[PDB]
Design a protein around this ligand. Structure first.
Ligand SMILES: [Mg+2]
Ligand SMILES: [Mg+2]
Lengths: 210, 218
């Protein structure tokens, strides 16, 4: 029975400024924090933990900025893939090949028998998502159905809860297409400053709406 | 630089409970409030004021509830259409045809030369929107382009700012397809309790935000 959580990581540049460290070191703190967060989500019973790694727009950051971020996200998977199920999706054509190749090999040997999945979405953008689905089925089916759309969306199931730390109240190209009933939670805390208590009080807020 | 604004109306049933009045009278207050809000948005220089009238799910309400709501939204347009440009879009097949006929007549009588547009989206639901676009172009084009998608989405441009009163921190069926970087503002105030000051401080919050569009500052 799916119960799933989506995180929109944010605040690494601001944290690097706050701490007086490089962007690389802030993204290293992000890797550590996302491993923590993945374990919190698993402990809390979520069946999939979705992490929005990147938008299409993000890949127009500088080459160094893209490498910093993509390496830091991939390092989460290097550390976790042997003890959870790893999957990924998105507008893969904008993801630099080096990261796609590495993430695919990690996916291929990840722990497929795990009841818990870490799922990365890369290159998020509703317009690119819809264009890809259209082009796959164009002329090949009589009509698009809700089932076929759900089976081809980047996020493969409805998202129950979405958390965005870092102070910005916006989706920034990360909205999950097939989640009309998702509950959203925003907080100012930068991702790298989030504690388990911060996560727990976010879940109190999210769970106490229903 | 030009900006637009979208409002997600919410809170009519709770307001009827709070005020001790019928749902119909709460929707009458909503009509009054939306006429106010439309004027505030125009005064603030927004090019278009978008109102998310309904989701597809809304049309599973009772027939009386649907008529009450659709009449109350249409009354907004009856009152203001003569001095602005009115347009509408959405999953129109789920809207009872009476309202489509009246709204089309009001659009025809509205001021197409106006520098301000009131735009209603009805039957919002991204799955239905996408399915409608697919079925329109299926087998008729070699590939879907961003340009064609933008020209056929319910909301005809990216939305800069959207406001959701009523306390729910969620987008329901109302997230605008072609707005990756819309700023969202939520507040607990029920729509029918919102004052001009409430609107003004929402705009302070929205306008102060640093919009980055997925990039870092240069
Ligand atoms: Mg950021
Ligand atoms: Mg409501």
């Amino acid at each position: 029975m799916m119960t799933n959580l989506m995180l929109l990581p944010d605040g690494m540049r601001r944290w690097s400024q706050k701490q007086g460290i490089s962007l690389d070191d802030s993204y290293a703190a992000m890797t550590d924090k996302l491993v923590e967060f993945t374990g919190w989500a698993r402990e809390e019973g979520f069946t999939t933990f979705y992490v929005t790694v990147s938008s299409v727009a993000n890949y127009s950051r500088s080459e160094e900025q893209v490498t910093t971020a993509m390496n830091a996200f991939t390092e989460v998977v290097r550390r976790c893939h042997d003890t959870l199920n790893f999957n990924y999706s998105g507008t893969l054509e904008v993801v630099p090949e080096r990261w796609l190749t590495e993430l695919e090999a990690l996916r291929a040997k990840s722990d497929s028998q795990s009841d818990f999945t870490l799922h990365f979405i890369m290159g998020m953008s509703l317009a690119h998502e819809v264009i890809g689905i259209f082009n796959k089925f164009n002329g090949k089916i009589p009509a698009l159905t809700e089932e076929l759309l759900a089976a081809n969306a980047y996020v493969p199931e409805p998202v129950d809860f979405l958390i965005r730390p870092g102070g910005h109240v916006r989706m920034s190209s990360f909205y999950p297409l097939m989640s009309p009933f998702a509950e959203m939670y925003f907080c100012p805390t930068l991702l790298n400053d989030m504690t388990r208590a911060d996560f727990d009080v976010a879940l109190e807020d999210l769970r106490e709406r229903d």
